[PDB]
Amino acid sequence: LPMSPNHGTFGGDGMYSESKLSLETLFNRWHSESWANQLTVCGAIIGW
Amino acid sequence: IPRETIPFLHLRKKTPAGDWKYDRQLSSLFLDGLEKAAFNGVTFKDKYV
Amino acid sequence: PVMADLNGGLQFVPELKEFTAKLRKELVETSEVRKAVSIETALEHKVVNGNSADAAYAQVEIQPRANIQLDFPELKPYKQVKQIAPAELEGLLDLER
Amino acid sequence: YRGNYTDFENTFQKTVEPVYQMHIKTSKDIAVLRSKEWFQLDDEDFDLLNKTLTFETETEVTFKNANIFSSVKCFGPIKVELPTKETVEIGIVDYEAGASHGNPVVDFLKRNGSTLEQKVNLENPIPI
């Protein structure tokens, strides 16, 4: 997962921060749903 | 890695509290990997991407 | 699930937006004052010291024109030529064939 | 006196330059002004930002050759608009140059300002 460290920190992302923050639910969905043997989540917080 | 220092690259571990803080073990697993990859390289033979 | 911080400490620098923006302003300003001051000290020179004394001080650029060439083949010095083929070859061949 | 004169050593010209108004809007604006050695205000700490300046200039010149000036003086008060639209002295224009060729101060103010002329035309001339 291409994650971001800056959720609407900077000016006008459009809806970028929103897209990048949503991704982070997979860290829990992995456990709570049932695809755990088909996918694994590896969230990378890409820097500058 | 100094005591009381978080490396510029690190892995994180979710506390039961729910937060994702720096875990020195995981970050050592990761950084040591990176080192070993700098000296030997890594193969991706047989990996479909 | 694994979470990897590949963010080289940016996390720690406070008010990152405004901090970021400041660096940019300071840079851009320093550029524009520096370039505006020089463009004016340069016109002051053309006024005080004449534009005909500065006109004979620019250089002339030369621009290329096309010189299409037939591109004959290159003939080496004979010394080097005789090094290519065996010395035995000299006069062995009927050059009429 | 009509005729051909080379008298240049005994020639000289004073002229009263029109008032130049200058609207210091930006930060680089104030920077460029502080760049010129003839721009000389009383408190250097004066906040030029967002004020309006006027330059009431006199330029005194002496010829030495056909086209080349021997010396060029250019002086006058620098003033700032008040809210009352009154104008108060802020500093000086103080230029001096030998072997000049043109007036740098007036050229600057020409291009970087507007020229206040006190004459205001009617719409149509009215015959008397």
Curated annotation (Swiss-Prot), chain A:
PTM details?
4'-phosphopantetheine is transferred from CoA to a specific serine of the Acyl carrier domain by the C-terminal PPT domain. This modification is essential for activity because fatty acids are bound in thioester linkage to the sulfhydryl of the prosthetic group.
Its biological purpose is as follows:
Fatty acid synthetase catalyzes the formation of long-chain fatty acids from acetyl-CoA, malonyl-CoA and NADPH. The alpha subunit contains domains for: acyl carrier protein, 3-oxoacyl-[acyl-carrier-protein] reductase, and 3-oxoacyl-[acyl-carrier-protein] synthase. This subunit coordinates the binding of the six beta subunits to the enzyme complex.
The miscellaneous comment for this protein is: Present with 17000 molecules/cell in log phase SD medium.
The UniProt subunit note reads as follows: [Alpha(6)beta(6)] hexamers of two multifunctional subunits (alpha and beta).
Sequence similarity = Belongs to the thiolase-like superfamily. Fungal fatty acid synthetase subunit alpha family.
- Its recorded name reads Fatty acid synthase subunit alpha
Originating organism: Saccharomyces cerevisiae (strain ATCC 204508 / S288c) (Baker's yeast)
Primary gene name? FAS2
Q: Which residues of the full protein are shown?
A: 824 to 871 of 1887
Swiss-Prot record, chain B:
User: Organism's domain of life?
Assistant: Eukaryota
Quote the PTM field. Answer: 4'-phosphopantetheine is transferred from CoA to a specific serine of the Acyl carrier domain by the C-terminal PPT domain. This modification is essential for activity because fatty acids are bound in thioester linkage to the sulfhydryl of the prosthetic group.
Role, per record: Fatty acid synthetase catalyzes the formation of long-chain fatty acids from acetyl-CoA, malonyl-CoA and NADPH. The alpha subunit contains domains for: acyl carrier protein, 3-oxoacyl-[acyl-carrier-protein] reductase, and 3-oxoacyl-[acyl-carrier-protein] synthase. This subunit coordinates the binding of the six beta subunits to the enzyme complex.
Q: What family is it from?
A: Belongs to the thiolase-like superfamily. Fungal fatty acid synthetase subunit alpha family.
Subunit relationships: [Alpha(6)beta(6)] hexamers of two multifunctional subunits (alpha and beta).
Additional observations: Present with 17000 molecules/cell in log phase SD medium.
Protein name, as recorded: Fatty acid synthase subunit alpha
Per the UniProt record, the source organism is: Saccharomyces cerevisiae (strain ATCC 204508 / S288c) (Baker's yeast)
Q: Which gene encodes it?
A: FAS2
UniProtKB/Swiss-Prot annotation, chain D:
What is said about its interaction partners and assembly? Answer: [Alpha(6)beta(6)] hexamers of two multifunctional subunits (alpha and beta).
Record function comment: Fatty acid synthetase catalyzes the formation of long-chain fatty acids from acetyl-CoA, malonyl-CoA and NADPH. The beta subunit contains domains for: [acyl-carrier-protein] acetyltransferase and malonyltransferase, S-acyl fatty acid synthase thioesterase, enoyl-[acyl-carrier-protein] reductase, and 3-hydroxypalmitoyl-[acyl-carrier-protein] dehydratase.
Source organism of the structure: Saccharomyces cerevisiae (strain ATCC 204508 / S288c) (Baker's yeast)
Q: What else is known?
A: Present with 91800 molecules/cell in log phase SD medium.
Task: Kindly provide the name given to this protein in its UniProt entry.
Answer: Fatty acid synthase subunit beta
Give the family this protein belongs to, as stated in its UniProt record.
Belongs to the fungal fatty acid synthetase subunit beta family.
